[PDB]
Amino acid sequence: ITGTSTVGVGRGVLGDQKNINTTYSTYYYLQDNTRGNGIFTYDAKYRTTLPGSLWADADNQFFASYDAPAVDAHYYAGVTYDYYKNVHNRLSYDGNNAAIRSSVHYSQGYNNAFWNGSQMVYGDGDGQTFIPLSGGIDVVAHELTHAVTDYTAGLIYQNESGAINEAISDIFGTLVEFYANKNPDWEIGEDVYTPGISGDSLRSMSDPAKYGDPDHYSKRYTGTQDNGGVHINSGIINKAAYLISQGGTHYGVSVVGIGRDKLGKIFYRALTQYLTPTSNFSQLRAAAVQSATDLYGSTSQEVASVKQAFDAVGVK
Numbered sequence: 001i002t003g004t005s006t007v008g009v010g011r012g013v014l015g016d017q018k019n020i021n022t023t024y025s026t027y028y029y030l031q032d033n034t035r036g037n038g039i040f041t042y043d044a045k046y047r048t049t050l051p052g053s054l055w056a057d058a059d060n061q062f063f064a065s066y067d068a069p070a071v072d073a074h075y076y077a078g079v080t081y082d083y084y085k086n087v088h089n090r091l092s093y094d095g096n097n098a099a100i101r102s103s104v105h106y107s108q109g110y111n112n113a114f115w116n117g118s119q120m121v122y123g124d125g126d127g128q129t130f131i132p133l134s135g136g137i138d139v140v141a142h143e144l145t146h147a148v149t150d151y152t153a154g155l156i157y158q159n160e161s162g163a164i165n166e167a168i169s170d171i172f173g174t175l176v177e178f179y180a181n182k183n184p185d186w187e188i189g190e191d192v193y194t195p196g197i198s199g200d201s202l203r204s205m206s207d208p209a210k211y212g213d214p215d216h217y218s219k220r221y222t223g224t225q226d227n228g229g230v231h232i233n234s235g236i237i238n239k240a241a242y243l244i245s246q247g248g249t250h251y252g253v254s255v256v257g258i259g260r261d262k263l264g265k266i267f268y269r270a271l272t273q274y275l276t277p278t279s280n281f282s283q284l285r286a287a288a289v290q291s292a293t294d295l296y297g298s299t300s301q302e303v304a305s306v307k308q309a310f311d312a313v314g315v316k
Protein backbone atom coordinates (compact mmCIF):
# COMPACT_ATOMS: atom_id res chain seq x y z
CA ILE A 1 0.00 0.00 0.00
CA THR A 2 1.01 3.62 -0.47
CA GLY A 3 1.85 5.33 2.80
CA THR A 4 4.63 6.60 4.99
CA SER A 5 7.22 4.42 6.67
CA THR A 6 6.78 4.08 10.41
CA VAL A 7 8.21 2.06 13.32
CA GLY A 8 5.90 0.02 15.49
CA VAL A 9 6.68 -1.99 18.58
CA GLY A 10 5.39 -5.31 19.80
CA ARG A 11 6.08 -8.69 21.31
CA GLY A 12 6.96 -11.90 19.50
CA VAL A 13 5.90 -15.47 20.13
CA LEU A 14 8.48 -15.99 22.90
CA GLY A 15 7.48 -12.77 24.72
CA ASP A 16 10.36 -10.58 23.55
CA GLN A 17 9.85 -6.93 22.60
CA LYS A 18 11.05 -5.74 19.22
CA ASN A 19 10.59 -2.82 16.84
CA ILE A 20 9.09 -3.49 13.44
CA ASN A 21 8.93 -1.51 10.23
CA THR A 22 5.38 -0.60 9.32
CA THR A 23 3.53 1.66 6.87
CA TYR A 24 0.89 4.20 7.84
CA SER A 25 -2.15 4.95 5.72
CA THR A 26 -5.24 5.15 7.98
CA TYR A 27 -4.04 1.94 9.62
CA TYR A 28 -0.52 0.79 10.40
CA TYR A 29 0.32 -2.12 8.12
CA LEU A 30 2.99 -4.80 8.42
CA GLN A 31 4.77 -3.45 5.38
CA ASP A 32 8.50 -2.78 5.76
CA ASN A 33 9.64 -0.39 3.03
CA THR A 34 13.25 -0.32 4.24
CA ARG A 35 14.24 -3.57 2.53
CA GLY A 36 14.13 -4.08 -1.21
CA ASN A 37 10.64 -3.76 -2.66
CA GLY A 38 9.14 -4.47 0.73
CA ILE A 39 8.37 -7.14 3.29
CA PHE A 40 4.65 -7.72 3.70
CA THR A 41 2.96 -9.80 6.41
CA TYR A 42 -0.63 -11.04 6.12
CA ASP A 43 -3.33 -12.51 8.36
CA ALA A 44 -4.74 -15.81 7.11
CA LYS A 45 -7.36 -15.72 9.93
CA TYR A 46 -7.18 -19.46 10.68
CA ARG A 47 -8.21 -20.25 7.11
CA THR A 48 -6.29 -21.60 4.13
CA THR A 49 -7.01 -18.92 1.51
CA LEU A 50 -3.76 -17.12 0.71
CA PRO A 51 -2.35 -14.65 1.26
CA GLY A 52 -5.26 -13.34 3.30
CA SER A 53 -5.33 -9.68 4.38
CA LEU A 54 -2.32 -7.40 4.69
CA TRP A 55 -1.92 -7.04 8.44
CA ALA A 56 -3.60 -3.86 9.67
CA ASP A 57 -3.35 -2.42 13.18
CA ALA A 58 -4.95 0.72 14.58
CA ASP A 59 -2.18 2.00 16.85
CA ASN A 60 1.20 0.60 15.70
CA GLN A 61 1.51 -1.41 18.92
CA PHE A 62 1.60 -5.18 18.53
CA PHE A 63 1.40 -6.66 22.02
CA ALA A 64 -1.73 -8.81 21.67
CA SER A 65 -1.31 -12.58 21.73
CA TYR A 66 -2.83 -12.72 18.23
CA ASP A 67 -0.16 -10.27 16.99
CA ALA A 68 2.85 -12.29 18.12
CA PRO A 69 3.25 -14.64 15.13
CA ALA A 70 2.92 -11.69 12.76
CA VAL A 71 5.55 -9.65 14.63
CA ASP A 72 8.08 -12.49 14.35
CA ALA A 73 7.32 -13.47 10.75
CA HIS A 74 7.79 -9.83 9.77
CA TYR A 75 10.88 -9.16 11.89
CA TYR A 76 12.69 -12.41 11.09
CA ALA A 77 12.02 -11.99 7.36
CA GLY A 78 13.90 -8.69 7.77
CA VAL A 79 16.83 -10.39 9.48
CA THR A 80 16.94 -13.02 6.74
CA TYR A 81 16.88 -10.34 4.03
CA ASP A 82 19.74 -8.59 5.80
CA TYR A 83 21.76 -11.80 5.98
CA TYR A 84 21.47 -12.51 2.28
CA LYS A 85 22.19 -8.89 1.29
CA ASN A 86 25.04 -8.20 3.74
CA VAL A 87 26.73 -11.60 3.67
CA HIS A 88 26.11 -12.80 0.10
CA ASN A 89 25.27 -9.60 -1.81
CA ARG A 90 21.92 -11.12 -2.76
CA LEU A 91 18.91 -8.81 -2.96
CA SER A 92 15.88 -10.79 -1.78
CA TYR A 93 15.13 -14.33 -2.89
CA ASP A 94 15.19 -13.62 -6.63
CA GLY A 95 18.31 -11.43 -6.53
CA ASN A 96 16.27 -8.45 -7.78
CA ASN A 97 14.55 -7.34 -4.58
CA ALA A 98 11.28 -9.25 -5.04
CA ALA A 99 8.69 -8.34 -2.42
CA ILE A 100 8.73 -10.86 0.43
CA ARG A 101 5.29 -11.99 1.55
CA SER A 102 4.32 -14.10 4.58
CA SER A 103 0.99 -15.22 6.00
CA VAL A 104 0.49 -16.24 9.63
CA HIS A 105 -2.41 -17.87 11.43
CA TYR A 106 -2.67 -20.35 8.57
CA SER A 107 -5.36 -23.00 9.19
CA GLN A 108 -6.07 -24.43 12.67
CA GLY A 109 -3.64 -26.38 14.81
CA TYR A 110 -1.26 -26.39 11.85
CA ASN A 111 2.06 -28.00 12.74
CA ASN A 112 4.11 -26.72 9.82
CA ALA A 113 5.36 -23.85 7.70
CA PHE A 114 6.13 -23.75 3.98
CA TRP A 115 6.94 -21.80 0.87
CA ASN A 116 3.98 -22.21 -1.51
CA GLY A 117 5.83 -21.17 -4.69
CA SER A 118 5.08 -17.47 -4.06
CA GLN A 119 5.11 -16.71 -0.33
CA MET A 120 5.88 -18.03 3.14
CA VAL A 121 3.11 -19.59 5.19
CA TYR A 122 3.12 -20.27 8.96
CA GLY A 123 0.83 -22.38 11.06
CA ASP A 124 0.14 -21.64 14.71
CA GLY A 125 0.88 -25.22 15.74
CA ASP A 126 -1.44 -27.18 18.01
CA GLY A 127 0.31 -26.05 21.18
CA GLN A 128 1.77 -29.53 21.72
CA THR A 129 4.04 -30.31 18.78
CA PHE A 130 4.56 -26.62 17.87
CA ILE A 131 3.75 -23.12 18.98
CA PRO A 132 3.44 -20.54 16.18
CA LEU A 133 6.25 -21.44 13.87
CA SER A 134 7.38 -17.95 12.93
CA GLY A 135 8.75 -17.72 16.50
CA GLY A 136 11.83 -19.60 15.24
CA ILE A 137 14.35 -17.50 13.35
CA ASP A 138 15.83 -20.69 11.89
CA VAL A 139 12.34 -21.65 10.71
CA VAL A 140 11.70 -18.31 9.01
CA ALA A 141 15.10 -18.39 7.34
CA HIS A 142 14.53 -22.05 6.36
CA GLU A 143 11.35 -21.02 4.57
CA LEU A 144 12.80 -17.99 2.78
CA THR A 145 15.75 -20.13 1.74
CA HIS A 146 13.35 -22.44 -0.12
CA ALA A 147 12.51 -19.40 -2.29
CA VAL A 148 16.24 -18.76 -2.85
CA THR A 149 16.75 -22.37 -3.88
CA ASP A 150 13.77 -22.29 -6.22
CA TYR A 151 15.13 -19.20 -7.98
CA THR A 152 18.69 -20.60 -8.23
CA ALA A 153 19.57 -24.32 -8.26
CA GLY A 154 15.91 -25.30 -8.47
CA LEU A 155 16.45 -28.60 -6.66
CA ILE A 156 13.48 -30.85 -7.31
CA TYR A 157 11.66 -31.63 -4.03
CA GLN A 158 12.10 -35.39 -3.89
CA ASN A 159 14.80 -38.00 -3.28
CA GLU A 160 18.42 -36.80 -3.14
CA SER A 161 17.90 -33.42 -4.83
CA GLY A 162 15.05 -32.82 -2.37
CA ALA A 163 17.17 -33.76 0.62
CA ILE A 164 19.79 -31.28 -0.62
CA ASN A 165 17.01 -28.70 -0.94
CA GLU A 166 16.05 -29.37 2.68
CA ALA A 167 19.62 -29.30 3.96
CA ILE A 168 20.27 -25.97 2.19
CA SER A 169 17.27 -24.54 4.07
CA ASP A 170 18.52 -25.98 7.39
CA ILE A 171 22.08 -24.75 6.76
CA PHE A 172 21.06 -21.19 5.93
CA GLY A 173 18.37 -21.22 8.59
CA THR A 174 21.12 -21.98 11.08
CA LEU A 175 23.55 -19.45 9.62
CA VAL A 176 20.85 -16.75 9.89
CA GLU A 177 20.26 -17.83 13.50
CA PHE A 178 23.99 -17.35 14.17
CA TYR A 179 23.90 -14.01 12.29
CA ALA A 180 21.20 -12.70 14.64
CA ASN A 181 23.22 -14.20 17.52
CA LYS A 182 20.45 -14.98 19.99
CA ASN A 183 20.81 -18.45 21.51
CA PRO A 184 22.33 -19.83 18.29
CA ASP A 185 22.83 -23.56 17.83
CA TRP A 186 23.01 -26.28 15.19
CA GLU A 187 19.51 -27.54 16.04
CA ILE A 188 16.42 -26.86 13.93
CA GLY A 189 13.19 -25.42 15.32
CA GLU A 190 14.05 -25.67 19.02
CA ASP A 191 12.41 -22.33 19.88
CA VAL A 192 8.95 -23.40 18.68
CA TYR A 193 9.00 -27.21 18.98
CA THR A 194 7.30 -29.09 21.85
CA PRO A 195 6.77 -26.39 24.45
CA GLY A 196 6.25 -29.08 27.10
CA ILE A 197 9.66 -30.66 26.50
CA SER A 198 12.91 -28.79 27.11
CA GLY A 199 16.13 -29.41 25.24
CA ASP A 200 14.76 -31.06 22.11
CA SER A 201 14.29 -29.92 18.53
CA LEU A 202 12.77 -31.05 15.27
CA ARG A 203 16.15 -31.95 13.73
CA SER A 204 19.79 -31.74 14.78
CA MET A 205 22.57 -30.89 12.33
CA SER A 206 25.31 -31.74 14.83
CA ASP A 207 23.84 -35.15 15.56
CA PRO A 208 20.98 -35.97 13.18
CA ALA A 209 20.65 -39.44 14.68
CA LYS A 210 19.42 -37.94 17.98
CA TYR A 211 16.02 -37.46 16.26
CA GLY A 212 16.28 -40.57 14.09
CA ASP A 213 17.76 -39.09 10.94
CA PRO A 214 20.73 -40.62 9.10
CA ASP A 215 24.24 -39.26 9.55
CA HIS A 216 25.85 -41.47 6.93
CA TYR A 217 24.90 -42.30 3.34
CA SER A 218 24.76 -46.01 4.25
CA LYS A 219 21.75 -45.20 6.47
CA ARG A 220 19.82 -43.27 3.82
CA TYR A 221 16.07 -43.78 3.48
CA THR A 222 14.89 -44.95 0.05
CA GLY A 223 11.17 -45.44 0.61
CA THR A 224 8.45 -43.11 -0.59
CA GLN A 225 7.30 -41.30 2.55
CA ASP A 226 8.20 -37.62 2.91
CA ASN A 227 8.85 -37.20 -0.83
CA GLY A 228 11.49 -39.91 -0.63
CA GLY A 229 12.84 -38.78 2.74
CA VAL A 230 13.66 -35.14 2.01
CA HIS A 231 13.50 -34.19 5.73
CA ILE A 232 15.23 -37.44 6.72
CA ASN A 233 18.14 -37.75 4.31
CA SER A 234 18.85 -34.06 4.80
CA GLY A 235 20.62 -35.29 7.95
CA ILE A 236 23.48 -36.67 5.86
CA ILE A 237 24.16 -33.28 4.27
CA ASN A 238 23.44 -31.34 7.48
CA LYS A 239 26.05 -33.47 9.24
CA ALA A 240 28.57 -32.79 6.47
CA ALA A 241 27.93 -29.04 6.74
CA TYR A 242 28.25 -29.14 10.52
CA LEU A 243 31.57 -30.97 10.19
CA ILE A 244 32.91 -28.52 7.60
CA SER A 245 32.18 -25.63 9.96
CA GLN A 246 32.88 -27.10 13.40
CA GLY A 247 35.10 -30.12 12.71
CA GLY A 248 34.96 -33.47 14.44
CA THR A 249 35.70 -37.17 14.03
CA HIS A 250 32.75 -39.11 12.66
CA TYR A 251 32.88 -42.86 12.02
CA GLY A 252 36.63 -42.52 12.46
CA VAL A 253 37.07 -39.80 9.82
CA SER A 254 38.50 -36.55 11.18
CA VAL A 255 37.46 -33.18 9.73
CA VAL A 256 39.26 -29.92 10.40
CA GLY A 257 36.63 -27.20 10.93
CA ILE A 258 36.87 -23.99 8.91
CA GLY A 259 34.04 -22.03 10.57
CA ARG A 260 30.55 -20.85 9.72
CA ASP A 261 31.39 -17.96 7.42
CA LYS A 262 33.39 -20.16 5.05
CA LEU A 263 30.73 -22.89 5.20
CA GLY A 264 28.20 -20.29 4.10
CA LYS A 265 30.37 -18.96 1.30
CA ILE A 266 31.05 -22.45 -0.02
CA PHE A 267 27.42 -23.57 0.06
CA TYR A 268 26.05 -20.27 -1.27
CA ARG A 269 28.41 -20.55 -4.24
CA ALA A 270 27.49 -24.20 -4.77
CA LEU A 271 23.78 -23.35 -4.66
CA THR A 272 24.01 -20.45 -7.07
CA GLN A 273 26.76 -21.51 -9.50
CA TYR A 274 26.91 -25.31 -9.62
CA LEU A 275 23.83 -27.18 -8.37
CA THR A 276 21.00 -27.96 -10.78
CA PRO A 277 17.44 -29.21 -10.33
CA THR A 278 18.54 -32.86 -10.44
CA SER A 279 21.76 -32.75 -8.41
CA ASN A 280 22.38 -35.77 -6.22
CA PHE A 281 24.59 -36.03 -3.15
CA SER A 282 27.71 -36.98 -5.16
CA GLN A 283 27.13 -33.96 -7.38
CA LEU A 284 26.75 -31.75 -4.30
CA ARG A 285 30.14 -32.95 -3.06
CA ALA A 286 31.66 -32.04 -6.41
CA ALA A 287 29.92 -28.62 -6.38
CA ALA A 288 31.15 -27.90 -2.86
CA VAL A 289 34.71 -28.95 -3.72
CA GLN A 290 34.69 -26.76 -6.82
CA SER A 291 33.20 -23.85 -4.89
CA ALA A 292 35.86 -24.11 -2.19
CA THR A 293 38.53 -24.36 -4.90
CA ASP A 294 37.22 -21.16 -6.52
CA LEU A 295 37.18 -19.28 -3.24
CA TYR A 296 40.28 -20.59 -1.46
CA GLY A 297 42.44 -22.51 -3.91
CA SER A 298 42.92 -26.18 -4.77
CA THR A 299 45.61 -26.73 -2.12
CA SER A 300 43.65 -24.99 0.64
CA GLN A 301 42.58 -26.32 4.00
CA GLU A 302 39.03 -25.37 2.99
CA VAL A 303 39.01 -27.77 0.05
CA ALA A 304 40.63 -30.50 2.14
CA SER A 305 37.97 -30.09 4.83
CA VAL A 306 35.09 -30.25 2.36
CA LYS A 307 36.46 -33.57 1.10
CA GLN A 308 36.97 -34.90 4.64
CA ALA A 309 33.40 -33.99 5.62
CA PHE A 310 31.80 -35.72 2.65
CA ASP A 311 34.09 -38.72 3.23
CA ALA A 312 32.91 -38.79 6.85
CA VAL A 313 29.26 -39.05 5.80
CA GLY A 314 29.98 -41.63 3.09
CA VAL A 315 29.40 -39.44 0.02
CA LYS A 316 31.94 -39.80 -2.77
Ligand SMILES: CC(C)C[C@H](NP(=O)(O)CNC(=O)OCc1ccccc1)C(=O)N[C@@H](C)C(=O)O
Pocket: 111, 112, 113, 114, 115, 116, 117, 133, 138, 139, 142, 143, 146, 157, 188, 189, 202, 226, 231
Ligand atom coordinates in the same frame (compact mmCIF):
# COMPACT_ATOMS: atom_id res chain seq x y z
C1 LIG B 1 11.79 -25.86 9.74
C2 LIG B 1 10.48 -26.58 10.07
C3 LIG B 1 9.91 -26.14 11.41
C4 LIG B 1 9.46 -26.43 8.95
C5 LIG B 1 9.82 -27.19 7.66
N1 LIG B 1 8.79 -26.87 6.68
P1 LIG B 1 9.04 -27.10 5.05
O1 LIG B 1 9.16 -25.83 4.30
O2 LIG B 1 10.26 -28.01 4.89
C6 LIG B 1 7.53 -27.94 4.53
N2 LIG B 1 7.57 -28.35 3.15
C7 LIG B 1 6.49 -28.48 2.44
O3 LIG B 1 5.34 -28.22 2.84
O4 LIG B 1 6.70 -28.91 1.11
C8 LIG B 1 5.55 -29.21 0.33
C9 LIG B 1 5.15 -28.15 -0.66
C10 LIG B 1 4.28 -27.13 -0.29
C11 LIG B 1 3.89 -26.16 -1.22
C12 LIG B 1 4.38 -26.20 -2.53
C13 LIG B 1 5.24 -27.24 -2.89
C14 LIG B 1 5.62 -28.21 -1.96
C15 LIG B 1 9.90 -28.65 7.98
O5 LIG B 1 10.99 -29.19 8.23
N3 LIG B 1 8.74 -29.32 8.04
C16 LIG B 1 8.62 -30.72 8.43
C17 LIG B 1 7.81 -30.79 9.74
C18 LIG B 1 7.93 -31.55 7.38
O6 LIG B 1 7.21 -30.99 6.54
O7 LIG B 1 8.12 -32.79 7.44
Ligand SMILES: [Ca+2]
Pocket: 057, 058, 059, 060, 061, 062, 063
Ligand atom coordinates in the same frame (compact mmCIF):
# COMPACT_ATOMS: atom_id res chain seq x y z
CA1 LIG C 1 -2.37 -2.58 18.11
Ligand SMILES: [Ca+2]
Pocket: 177, 182, 183, 184, 185, 190, 191
Ligand atom coordinates in the same frame (compact mmCIF):
# COMPACT_ATOMS: atom_id res chain seq x y z
CA1 LIG D 1 18.60 -21.42 19.03
Ligand SMILES: [Ca+2]
Pocket: 138, 174, 177, 184, 185, 186, 187, 188, 189, 190
Ligand atom coordinates in the same frame (compact mmCIF):
# COMPACT_ATOMS: atom_id res chain seq x y z
CA1 LIG E 1 18.27 -23.45 15.84
Ligand SMILES: [Ca+2]
Pocket: 190, 193, 194, 195, 196, 197, 198, 199, 200, 201
Ligand atom coordinates in the same frame (compact mmCIF):
# COMPACT_ATOMS: atom_id res chain seq x y z
CA1 LIG F 1 10.67 -28.43 23.03
Ligand SMILES: [Zn+2]
Pocket: 142, 146, 166, 169
Ligand atom coordinates in the same frame (compact mmCIF):
# COMPACT_ATOMS: atom_id res chain seq x y z
ZN1 LIG G 1 11.93 -27.22 4.19
